[PDB]
């Protein structure tokens, strides 16, 4: 259905940083060769602060208009969307309409849009309908804008199961679907999962399911952000694990990740047989080798700080899980207040209840 | 939809032990603090012998009437049910009707009921309809009794996929759904699985799927019984694995498990950094460290014993898998009788065929 | 629904080898005891060269007519089929019709047929309808031919979810379904997966899902080919892993595998407790212990060879994945041609583009 | 699926009249020959006053036990049921359970039960489940009690469309379905229809749809009560119209209707060619020829009377339609009170508002 | 989807009359102008005796090869098919395959095929799959053969409701659907309807429903055979009634009907205002004005005759309805044998029971 049968790299850039707010886009747009992504995603949702998103959409039109023709990969900006926020949906749609105004010269270099936070199949149809309306409002060919989604809810994971048959209904244009991209960060929160370090679970079933959804429906599966940018070995191992599920693309957050991800699924240059101090302040190998499990006090410290500063929003949300749980317990189990105060001291308890 | 946004512990108690048959309930009802469950489940199904289940339902009304007001958690007794037994369904429904007679004073302290052995979504609706009828027979608010299910069949696992949309149909009241609880013990038998030791498979996909079903439908996911009560470390590791799937509650079988499970998902009191004889008859550390793989002779010994005594019923059923398989082979492969007798000796063979 | 409640072994034989083309069948038909499969599958699809498949179907009728009565297991030949090839479907159906001509004496010893490469549930119905027509064309009892399928697509994996309810519709006879068999080889290609060595991924979710589909629908789950015939230990470990998912049967490719698979799910003869040079050119233990990761040059060498000879077809297809990917990249990323030539040298590049 | 391929007559009898309350049943049970129905329906729902329905169910067991063996047609008593009343459902189920106690000797002469007021297909399943439970509670063969439904809601009319496929699901026993019977009286009220005289609309589409539902699903279609017992010509014309839709059975309310309905679909005794005072107080031919359109005053008179006496309940409900409408208008259109009082006088208005 | 946006006339011809069996086809093929149909249907099903249908399919290839190029309308032969006969389905498919052999020169003048007696939507898919296989077996363009169906069952009428969404599924090619044609003759029997004269009911709902199905799915609605060929006025009135439902085409059985039907939906040549012996043996105006209602004796006479001669088969089937009903009554109501013998005399009764 789409020109790229495989996509190796899916690279996001912030659209407006709060200087030239568009600086990140103009540089990403100059990337070439192995450093340039099969798919580049100017990112008007999680990569860009919310107060900056209207300037972000302006910057997307400015840059793609100016540099879009020369970009060697395909361009699919990510808009705002949420299955549970009609205001967010309408926002994304308004931005899409602006960005594709043919008089501004960007649309002709835009292959499609990425829609995050989608829900059940009826939510996907609402995004599709916006695509169709944008196309008709600006005289584009029907179906010419590809839609890609980020799978970051239980709901969306289940929705991939019924796609082949829903896609063929005549009341939608969902043949425009292109990529199915996992969003482990938000999926973790939607699932209310938690780990001692805050590292993301690996969610091998999700990735299996997205790979399968993609092959059943004629889409392309892509894995989510691997945000420990220094862990080049870990990134490679994830990509290899993914390739064994038939998920041959991955999200990249830097141009070095892009190079690594562009190279990983290609056959090696030479064969190999497998069988059954030292520097100085380069002992930051130990930062690589360590991880920290925070206490209640730490998490509450951190949150209090982040709330006053209002750790990015996703870190804050991840912490909110165990804290929301602590607070549900405290509200509903008066019989446990004594063991809890004794467990954490009352300083912390009452502070944990103020957080959120 | 329900008051408890999180549930950490789901603790079952037998309802009639064959002295005061209700003794286990009266003590469980006195538990407080960290030893008391978020959800307490007086258990009229697998925890209670079948000849005792009618006295069990009487005991549930006596105890909850007498001690129910003071119980710090929520009370959700488990009734009998089976997707393939209309008599069992009707039994559970009769017990539910008795237990909730408002003149007996228990119902006002009962938040809902737990229904085991459910099947496809149409079986869930049959349980729901019984709830609705009980509510109307006794003037309770419609939807005031929460329903929780145990997922212990392939059928039920698949049914979670279609819940969001089935729940909204006007011919049911399935918005009453609260917990989705895995039942690994019976699920193992429904799946006809088997292990060399008889240890339960870990069934990570089931737990993933139940976690996902819960987040898609507004329910709460809970894992099943960890019956090796001495293996406190194993219990903790399972809980941690679960938390990484977004399954933050677990079944508890003793008040010590309850303490462990009540504490596990709470943040630690202090931080930690991670990196890449001796006693005497306390060498029962070796019982902890060992496991035994039985032979055909052992299993048939055991079964013959258990059948004469008629190892609990679930152990017997687990054994029945390889034995049923041995017997299917023997009935259908006369060409294999010689290698089989030679394999086990004829003593055993003919005994294996009498078992069942 | 079917006579065999359990099936341990599913053993395929080529139907026409290009001497007596039927030689493999006549020998397989003589197997007895532990060396003989619960289910024997004369294989007219992947085990038999395509130019030989019409003689294959003749050989199936000759041998089963001659030796079929004495065969101790059940006989279910595999026909050609493909969800995306109407010509292949019609071929399989024509062969089935010939094979079951009651005047040729084979049908009375044939329990059913195996259908590979099935897709969504509507494709399964197309196979079912062919069964029904064959039955009526030859006066067989309706439903007397069992249908077994090979699950080797994402589509088919998803289709198992809706089977219980689709099976009961009156417009089909899908109660004839017997085995659900995983086909990891082709499933790997349908999923576009790849591994460094070319070893098959383990696909634990697929096997979980097929086991679950089987228990939900009254079918029997069977795992796919373990083609490293020398790795007897690996075969045993896979069977044990499978048994823990409730997949108690497995495909066997030699009579020794048949013995191993016939023995594996039976209880051991004696108990066991578990706890927490040397020869000469027998150093082929090292062939067992090694594996090779090929380079681009190797893969392209190999393919060029195989294409000229036109490594079996499935190996060729597995290689086609990374090469198809390399070629999609080359066609769409002119900006990457320099780093690619430098990576592999231009000899290889232009050769990689000729392959396919 | 059922013994009677055609059913001509469906004759209801009250079960307890408030003397021998069972008198009507004992006589109906003696009917023979053309005066006896293909299907006799001891009627514990609309034919029997609600305060009498528990004695009604007792009378059904007494009479059928005593006279049931000799009855020449099939016996299918009608139980209470309502799609919107869980208490009514449970009542019907309790009565069914009592009536079929095999120790009372009625069940062996009962072919099935008639369930009125059914809704969407999920409500039909709730009735089916009660049947299945009754069968298992009393050791009857599964599926031996036929279920017949009365179609008297929009919901039920739509439900016939999806029956063939819902009937085959393994979670129900709806193959027990036998008759689909129109209930024009209640259907009229469910549809909120009204006529100037109070005569029932003819509802030709309903009858078409029920006929079609019956042929699509292997059931038998039957039309509803023709309560103008003296209008023998009208009854014949309705039966002829019905026969032209493939609805070959009809409800009968007297033994004379039974004779007429038993005779109508049989071929005439001789052929016929078609082409393009007088007595005295026998001028009650004029009662036959007239009908009366009541005024608001009449209807309110009547209702006030009926409410004080608390015209049967169905007449009262039919009147409630225009009156409910008048009252919705009065509550919501204060701007219309003057034209309304002038239209009816205020005597009536304020009385019309007290009615209901 | 298809070239003809409207179809006025759908004219059937027998394919082999038992002289030149193909005589009827060769003449129909010469029709031109107003006497020639928009759609001509060489009819290998009900118009042709069953013993003649294999020569019929040969004749279709001979004539269309010889005269097909010059035919001014579109050619869509009707094949045999039945929802409940796998042998009939396979027959139709075999004939379709022969007829479209491109080496015989007919296919290039064949626009599609007409499939009668279709059932639920899954039966329509079975016909579609045969089309797809025929296309691929002979190198035709996929979808180039239009499929038209005859709606002559309750099942098929209900199936039109779900067509838009089923048509878009990727496992079928049902976008090939062209005409939806009512078959009142067989639909009458499927519905088990009956009239005093044997005239067909008008079935206005069916026609409404088929018209609606056609507009919902992008198909064209056509009414069924009006077999009283002399009643030119009646034919016109039916066509006008149809046009008011949006069913603008009708079946034609003679070239005069073709002229009438070709002219009816065209605007009149001049305007008109509407407002609120005589010959000799031309008194066959009375045959036009009369109709005969047969007795039991007549019908049984007739059937006995027709059975010995074995009134066409459809007349015989129509009679079978009341007779099947009489026989169900006689088998099940021994209490009615006396009134029945008295009603018809025993001569007739026992004869009525031998018929069938
Ligand atoms: Cl919303
Ligand atoms: Cl959603
Ligand atoms: Cl993919
Ligand atoms: Cl059941
Ligand atoms: Cl079930
Ligand atoms: Cl949860
Ligand atoms: Cl295809
Ligand atoms: Cl498919
Ligand atoms: Cl899944
Ligand atoms: Cl299985
Ligand atoms: Cl209700
Ligand atoms: Cl309803
Ligand atoms: Cl009928
Ligand atoms: Cl059939
Ligand atoms: Cl059908
Ligand atoms: Cl039309
Ligand atoms: K579409
Ligand atoms: K569309
Ligand atoms: K994939
Ligand atoms: K609901
Ligand atoms: K409800
Ligand atoms: K969860
Ligand atoms: K079926
Ligand atoms: K069938
Ligand atoms: K299984
Ligand atoms: K059923
Ligand atoms: K059933
Ligand atoms: K209405
Ligand atoms: K009918
Ligand atoms: K299609
Ligand atoms: K298609
Ligand atoms: Na490019
Ligand atoms: Na509490
Ligand atoms: Na055997
Ligand atoms: Na009888
Ligand atoms: Na033409
Ligand atoms: Pb939501
Ligand atoms: Pb997001
Ligand atoms: Pb695929
Ligand atoms: Pb602090
Ligand atoms: Pb079951
Ligand atoms: Pb259980
Ligand atoms: Pb969610
Ligand atoms: Pb022993
Ligand atoms: Pb496909
Ligand atoms: Pb294959
Ligand atoms: Pb099961
Ligand atoms: Pb080379
Ligand atoms: Pb309602
Ligand atoms: Pb009613
Ligand atoms: Pb039918
Ligand atoms: Pb008055
Ligand atoms: Pb049928
Ligand atoms: Pb026909
Ligand atoms: Pb339309
Ligand atoms: Pb005669």
UniProtKB/Swiss-Prot annotation, chains A, B, C, D, E:
Function: Involved in the glyoxylate cycle which synthesizes precursors for carbohydrates from C2 compounds such as acetate. Catalyzes the Claisen condensation between acetyl-coenzyme A (acetyl-CoA) and glyoxylate to form the malyl-CoA intermediate that is subsequently hydrolyzed to produce malate and CoA.
Catalytic residues in the record: 312 (proton acceptor)
Protein name as catalogued: Malate synthase
Cell compartment(s), UniProt: Cytoplasm
Activity at various pH: Optimum pH is between 8 and 9.
Residues the record lists as binding acetyl-CoA: 12-13, 78, 230, 253
InterPro entries reported for this sequence: Malate_Synthase-like_Aldolase, Pyrv/PenolPyrv_kinase-like_dom, Pyrv_kinase-like_dom_sf
This protein's encoding gene: aceB
Enzyme's top EC category: transferase
Alphabetized GO MF terms: magnesium ion binding; malate synthase activity; metal ion binding
Record's catalysed reaction(s): glyoxylate + acetyl-CoA + H2O = (S)-malate + CoA + H(+)
Annotated binding of glyoxylate, by residue: 78, 152, 185-186
Chain positions recorded as Mg(2+) binding sites: 46, 152, 186
One GO cellular component, as annotated: cytoplasm
Similarity remark: Belongs to the HpcH/HpaI aldolase family.
E.C. code: 2.3.3.9
PANTHER family: CITRATE LYASE SUBUNIT BETA (PTHR32308:SF10), LYASE BETA SUBUNIT, PUTATIVE (AFU_ORTHOLOGUE AFUA_4G13030)-RELATED (PTHR32308)
């Amino acid at each position: 259905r789409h020109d790229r049968e495989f996509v190796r790299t899916f690279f996001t850039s912030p659209t407006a940083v709060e200087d030239d707010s568009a600086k990140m886009l103009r540089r990403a747009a100059g990337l070439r060769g192995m450093q340039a992504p099969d798919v580049w995603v100017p990112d008007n949702e999680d990569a860009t602060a919310p107060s900056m998103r209207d300037e972000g959409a302006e910057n997307i039109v400015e840059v793609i208009s100016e540099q879009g023709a020369e970009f060697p990969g395909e361009i699919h900006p990510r808009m705002v969307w949420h299955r549970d926020s009609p205001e967010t949906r309408y926002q994304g749609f308004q931005h899409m309409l602006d960005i594709t105004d043919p008089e501004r010269g960007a649309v002709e270099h835009i292959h499609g849009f990425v829609i995050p936070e989608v829900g059940g199949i009826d939510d996907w149809k609402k995004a599709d309908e916006f695509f169709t309306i944008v196309e008709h409002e600006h005289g584009l060919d029907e179906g010419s804008l590809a839609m890609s989604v980020i799978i970051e809810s239980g709901e969306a994971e289940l929705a991939m199961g019924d796609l082949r048959d829903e896609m063929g209904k005549p009341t939608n244009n969902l043949e425009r679907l292109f990529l199915l991209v996992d969003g482990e960060v938000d999926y973790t929160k939607d699932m209310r999962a938690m780990t001692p370090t805050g590292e993301l679970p690996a969610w091998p079933e999700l990735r299996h399911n997205t790979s399968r959804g993609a092959s059943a429906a004629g889409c392309v599966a892509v894995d989510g952000p691997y945000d420990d940018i220094r862990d080049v070995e870990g990134y490679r191992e994830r990509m290899t694990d993914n390739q064994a599920k038939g998920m041959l693309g991955i999200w990249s957050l830097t141009p070095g990740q892009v190079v690594e991800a562009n190279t990983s699924p290609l056959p090696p240059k030479t064969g190999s047989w497998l069988l059954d101090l030292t520097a100085d302040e380069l002992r930051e190998e130990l930062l690589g080798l360590t991880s920290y499990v925070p206490s209640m006090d730490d998490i509450v410290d951190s949150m209090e700080e982040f709330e006053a500063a209002k750790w990015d929003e996703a870190t804050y949300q991840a912490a909110m899980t165990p804290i929301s749980l602590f607070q549900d317990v405290y509200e509903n189990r008066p019989d446990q207040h004594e063991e809890l105060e004794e467990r954490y001291g009352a300083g912390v308890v009452e502070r944990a209840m103020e957080v959120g």
